[PDB]
Amino acid sequence: TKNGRDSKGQRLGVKIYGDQVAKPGAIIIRQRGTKFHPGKNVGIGKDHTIFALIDGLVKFEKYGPDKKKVSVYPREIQPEN
Amino acid sequence: KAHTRREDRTARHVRIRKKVEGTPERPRLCVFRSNKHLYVQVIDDTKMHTLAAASTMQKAISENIDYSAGPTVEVAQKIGEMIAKSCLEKGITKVAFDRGGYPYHGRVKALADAAREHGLVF
Amino acid sequence: DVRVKVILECTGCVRKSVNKGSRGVSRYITQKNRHNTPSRLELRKFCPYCYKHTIHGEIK
Amino acid sequence: AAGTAVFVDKAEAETINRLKTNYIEKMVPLLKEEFSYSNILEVPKVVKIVVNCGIGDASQNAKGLDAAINELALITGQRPVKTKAKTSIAGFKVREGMTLGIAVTLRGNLMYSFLDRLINLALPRTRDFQGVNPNSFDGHGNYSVGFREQSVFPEIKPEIVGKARGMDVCITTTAKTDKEAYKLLSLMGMPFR
Amino acid sequence: RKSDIHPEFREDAKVYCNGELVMTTGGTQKDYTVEVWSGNHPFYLGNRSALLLDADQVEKFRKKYG
Amino acid sequence: MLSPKRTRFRKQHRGRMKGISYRGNRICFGRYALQALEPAWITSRQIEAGRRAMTRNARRGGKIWVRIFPDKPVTVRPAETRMGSGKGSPEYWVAVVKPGRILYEISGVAENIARRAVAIAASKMPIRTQFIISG
RNA sequence: UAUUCUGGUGUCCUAGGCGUAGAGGAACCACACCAAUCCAUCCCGAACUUGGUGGUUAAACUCUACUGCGGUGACGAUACUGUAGGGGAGGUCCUGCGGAAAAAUAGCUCGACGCCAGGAU
RNA sequence: UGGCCCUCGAGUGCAAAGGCAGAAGGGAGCUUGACUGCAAGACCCACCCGUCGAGCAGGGACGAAAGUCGGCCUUAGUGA
Ligand SMILES: [Mg+2]
Ligand SMILES: [Mg+2]
Ligand SMILES: [Mg+2]
Ligand SMILES: [Mg+2]
Ligand SMILES: [Mg+2]
Ligand SMILES: [Mg+2]
Ligand SMILES: [Mg+2]
Ligand SMILES: [Mg+2]
Ligand SMILES: [Mg+2]
Ligand SMILES: [Mg+2]
Ligand SMILES: [Mg+2]
Ligand SMILES: [Mg+2]
Ligand SMILES: [Mg+2]
Ligand SMILES: [Mg+2]
Ligand SMILES: [Mg+2]
Ligand SMILES: [Mg+2]
Numbered sequence: 001t002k003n004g005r006d007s008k009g010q011r012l013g014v015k016i017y018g019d020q021v022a023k024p025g026a027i028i029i030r031q032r033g034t035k036f037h038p039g040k041n042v043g044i045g046k047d048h049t050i051f052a053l054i055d056g057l058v059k060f061e062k063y064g065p066d067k068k069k070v071s072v073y074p075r076e077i078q079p080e081n
Numbered sequence: 082k083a084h085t086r087r088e089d090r091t092a093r094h095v096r097i098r099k100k101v102e103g104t105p106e107r108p109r110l111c112v113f114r115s116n117k118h119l120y121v122q123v124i125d126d127t128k129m130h131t132l133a134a135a136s137t138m139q140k141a142i143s144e145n146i147d148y149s150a151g152p153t154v155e156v157a158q159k160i161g162e163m164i165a166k167s168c169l170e171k172g173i174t175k176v177a178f179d180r181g182g183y184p185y186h187g188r189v190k191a192l193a194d195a196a197r198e199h200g201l202v203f
Numbered sequence: 204d205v206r207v208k209v210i211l212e213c214t215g216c217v218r219k220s221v222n223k224g225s226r227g228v229s230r231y232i233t234q235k236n237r238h239n240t241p242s243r244l245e246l247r248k249f250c251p252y253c254y255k256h257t258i259h260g261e262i263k
Numbered sequence: 264a265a266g267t268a269v270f271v272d273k274a275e276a277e278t279i280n281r282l283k284t285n286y287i288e289k290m291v292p293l294l295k296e297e298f299s300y301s302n303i304l305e306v307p308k309v310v311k312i313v314v315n316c317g318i319g320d321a322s323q324n325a326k327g328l329d330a331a332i333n334e335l336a337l338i339t340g341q342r343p344v345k346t347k348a349k350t351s352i353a354g355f356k357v358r359e360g361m362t363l364g365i366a367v368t369l370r371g372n373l374m375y376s377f378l379d380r381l382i383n384l385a386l387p388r389t390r391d392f393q394g395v396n397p398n399s400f401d402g403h404g405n406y407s408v409g410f411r412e413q414s415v416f417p418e419i420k421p422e423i424v425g426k427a428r429g430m431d432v433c434i435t436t437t438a439k440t441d442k443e444a445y446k447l448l449s450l451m452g453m454p455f456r
Numbered sequence: 457r458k459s460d461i462h463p464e465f466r467e468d469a470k471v472y473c474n475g476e477l478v479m480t481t482g483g484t485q486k487d488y489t490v491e492v493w494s495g496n497h498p499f500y501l502g503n504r505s506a507l508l509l510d511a512d513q514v515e516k517f518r519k520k521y522g
Numbered sequence: 523m524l525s526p527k528r529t530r531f532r533k534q535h536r537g538r539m540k541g542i543s544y545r546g547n548r549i550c551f552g553r554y555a556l557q558a559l560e561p562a563w564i565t566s567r568q569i570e571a572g573r574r575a576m577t578r579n580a581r582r583g584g585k586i587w588v589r590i591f592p593d594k595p596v597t598v599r600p601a602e603t604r605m606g607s608g609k610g611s612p613e614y615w616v617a618v619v620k621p622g623r624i625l626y627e628i629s630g631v632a633e634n635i636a637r638r639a640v641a642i643a644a645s646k647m648p649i650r651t652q653f654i655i656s657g
Numbered sequence: 658u659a660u661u662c663u664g665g666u667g668u669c670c671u672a673g674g675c676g677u678a679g680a681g682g683a684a685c686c687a688c689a690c691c692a693a694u695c696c697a698u699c700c701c702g703a704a705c706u707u708g709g710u711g712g713u714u715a716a717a718c719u720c721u722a723c724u725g726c727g728g729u730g731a732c733g734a735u736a737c738u739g740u741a742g743g744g745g746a747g748g749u750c751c752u753g754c755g756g757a758a759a760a761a762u763a764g765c766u767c768g769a770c771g772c773c774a775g776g777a778u
Numbered sequence: 779u780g781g782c783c784c785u786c787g788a789g790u791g792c793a794a795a796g797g798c799a800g801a802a803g804g805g806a807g808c809u810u811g812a813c814u815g816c817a818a819g820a821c822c823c824a825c826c827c828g829u830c831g832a833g834c835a836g837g838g839a840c841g842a843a844a845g846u847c848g849g850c851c852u853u854a855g856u857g858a
């Protein structure tokens with residue numbers, strides 16, 4: 001009949017990208033369903049929020065054959081120029 | 082949908098293997114039971130390595146106990162023992178039990194209990 | 204209406220002002236469907252005072 | 264006009280021997296030879312016989328359900344299972360979980376025994392009988408026959424029966440074709456066409 | 457078989473036919489008293505002859521008159 | 523008059539018309555054809571009229587394929603209606619055609635009768651067009 | 658120390674799948690058969706369970722092979738576009754410098770790599 | 779009720795979207811973590827609110843154990 005009701009955009013989507021840095025607890029992705037799957041060193045929440053358990057570079061991977069999963073790997077910073 | 086018993090047990094083994102995971106401090110205790118033979122392994126998944134493996138195909142239990150058709154409860158207990166000693170000598174105490182698709186019962190159950198009385202923790 | 208707020212209360216709690224370290228009457232609260240299940244709900248739940256899981260019944 | 268039930272009536276006999284031992288002794292060599300199989304295990308075997316009562320008006324009155332359960336029991340020596348309807352159906356006045364039919368599965372030795380009390384006992388005692396249709400196979404080698412009323416079996420006592428209740432019987436065989444399955448049944452004494 | 461829920465299956469069932477025939481079968485009862493079983497039923501031969509031979513109007517005419 | 527039998531939402535976007543249509547380019551049915559030169563919006567009434575004209579002028583010649591069809595809805599607000607309080611009522615239906623697109627295919631005549639018939643067809647079209655022969 | 662084979666067990670991945678043809682029974686894996694005190698079926702020793710037999714590669718799995726299906730997939734070109742302009746009444750067109758598909762065909766594909774036990778050389 | 783072929787097209791209390799096949803879908807057994815005390819760090823952000831949570835202690839539930847459990851596949855169901 002008469003339209004015009006709607007919703008504020010929920011702020012979902014990738015918060016930290018591939019090869020950026022994460023704190024422990026830092027939220028990597030807010031999603032509705034699971035458009036990503038938890039990998040290693042990485043926990044998943046009730047709303048399927050994915051968060052880091054470890055400081056380090058976050059890397060996305062083929063879950064296989066089709067889907068995707070995210071996991072966090074510890075990096076090494078020696079190379080100070 | 083696989084109604085071949087084989088494929089079915091593989092299904093259950095994978096389902097169980099979802100939850101239980103071999104780590105350096107808590108290796109996976111892996112039971113395989115075939116018709117003429119009982120085979121058991123111990124795995125660290127992170128390093129992708131088996132530390133100790135005991136089976137009815139080894140001369141120890143071969144010269145100890147012989148059986149007619151299927152592996153007996155007795156066979157099982159002898160194996161649980163063998164692997165308990167084998168692992169306690171490499172410094173592995175605390176491990177996780179992979180029932181490898183089979184219902185925990187019968188010679189699986191007895192396998193477990195034999196490994197427990199002998200100083201293996203699970 | 205047909206779905207109601209119910210108070211659970213520890214049965215073994217004595218309102219007399221007990222002599223222990225922490226004194227108080229545990230109550231939880233929750234909802235029941237008064238039609239579906241007319242039986243007075245009983246639930247085993249934790250009590251901060253008794254320190255053990257006790258049985259919490261209801262109040263009218 | 265060809266009689267393979269002159270095999271079934273042949274001499275004073277025993278049960279186990281009849282079905283299972285005439286299978287191992289006689290049937291298996293016969294089939295092994297006439298279809299020329301390159302291994303023994305390719306022989307057609309009888310897997311299972313499920314007997315299925317279809318009564319949906321029995322959901323209304325549970326006593327008919329209990330009665331027919333007892334009937335199918337005394338017939339098959341096995342206390343039946345009561346099958347629940349999966350979906351809510353309008354025109355049949357059915358909702359989910361409502362008890363519709365009555366089903367038993369017969370396996371192992373009871374399979375052979377009930378099969379025997381079928382061909383050699385109730386089938387001839389039936390109402391006017393010509394032969395069971397050769398055309399009732401499913402193409403993959405499993406056969407089905409209806410029984411319009413259950414007074415067929417003597418375990419069923421006809422004066423004590425309140426109402427006539429129908430049965431369906433489904434024979435399941437490892438056979439992949441109907442020829443092999445048909446030879447299997449007939450060789451075992453079945454009255455075809 | 458699960459115990460006590462099933463009706464008792466007596467493995468020995470003597471089939472007694474009134475032609476004094478005694479065979480063995482299986483069933484809940486010990487003895488079955490039978491009339492008209494597989495062997496000793498019209499089906500094989502007698503019924504074939506009755507269904508297939510019952511026509512013949514011309515000879516039926518000639519038997520009356522001739 | 524051509525038109526879709528059902529859609530969920532009544533009202534639709536004007537859209538935007540760009541490029542070439544590479545797909546409808548070929549002539550796969552008949553012999554001679556009418557090709558759309560320019561980016562436009564064909565009402566079902568125009569296709570109707572063009573087809574009727576080509577059909578009547580051909581007559582004794584056999585066959586006319588209509589290679590297009592008006593599946594996108596179009597909406598209008600009434601007269602003396604102040605702007606606001608909702609999108610209007612769909613009146614008619616259009617087909618979106620881009621340059622290179624084939625409209626009419628025709629078979630069963632000499633090239634002369636076909637050139638003339640296709641001309642009378644292109645007279646009821648909103649757009650510039652072309653005459654082409656099968657390969 | 659090698660190699661080869663069986664069974665277990667995993668990680669990587671281009672997700673190695675279906676089909677057709679062939680090989681495997683000494684060992685291993687499997688089914689087959691038999692009997693039901695541990696446990697077992699909303700009915701059924703079918704499954705799952707304990708204990709026997711010694712049958713068979715039929716099913717299963719395993720291994721070699723093949724493009725028929727399936728899966729994968731360019732180069733180039735074009736569509737589109739970033740920025741600098743131009744034409745058209747407009748719908749929209751065109752140029753220079755930079756990026757660059759989808760589709761389709763050419764090809765590619767019948768997985769790779771590791772530990773353990775157990776034979777063989 | 780029996781069987782063969784397609785393989786995710788059903789389902790998920792209710793809209794729609796995103797998820798989810800040996801599963802988040804269907805069933806069975808035992809249960810009350812639909813707990814107390816908290817909490818590094820994040821996301822969202824005018825403010826007020828709102829969301830995710832590794833981890834610690836107490837006292838438990840299921841489980842042989844490993845472990846999982848601070849309501850519900852997620853997002854509405856509310857009011858300073
Ligand atoms: Mg939104
Ligand atoms: Mg949680
Ligand atoms: Mg065995
Ligand atoms: Mg007939
Ligand atoms: Mg251009
Ligand atoms: Mg297109
Ligand atoms: Mg014009
Ligand atoms: Mg590939
Ligand atoms: Mg490849
Ligand atoms: Mg084979
Ligand atoms: Mg190909
Ligand atoms: Mg292809
Ligand atoms: Mg290129
Ligand atoms: Mg440009
Ligand atoms: Mg410009
Ligand atoms: Mg360019």
Ligand SMILES: [Mg+2]
Nearest residue numbers: 754755756757
């Ligand atoms: Mg370039």
Ligand SMILES: [Mg+2]
Nearest residue numbers: 731757758759
């Ligand atoms: Mg590309």
Ligand SMILES: [Mg+2]
Nearest residue numbers: 730759760761
């Ligand atoms: Mg491509």
Ligand SMILES: [Mg+2]
Nearest residue numbers: 720721767768
């Ligand atoms: Mg290879």
Ligand SMILES: [Mg+2]
Nearest residue numbers: 790792793794
């Ligand atoms: Mg819905």
Ligand SMILES: [Mg+2]
Nearest residue numbers: 794795796797
């Ligand atoms: Mg959906």
Ligand SMILES: [Mg+2]
Nearest residue numbers: 801802803804
């Ligand atoms: Mg579930």
Ligand SMILES: [Mg+2]
Nearest residue numbers: 832833834845
């Ligand atoms: Mg913890």
Ligand SMILES: [Mg+2]
Nearest residue numbers: 831832833848
């Ligand atoms: Mg926690």
Ligand SMILES: [Mg+2]
Nearest residue numbers: 835836837838
């Ligand atoms: Mg705790």
Ligand SMILES: [Mg+2]
Nearest residue numbers: 839840841842
């Ligand atoms: Mg306990």
Ligand SMILES: [Mg+2]
Nearest residue numbers: 790802850851
């Ligand atoms: Mg749930």
Ligand SMILES: [Zn+2]
Nearest residue numbers: 213216250253
């Ligand atoms: Zn208390």
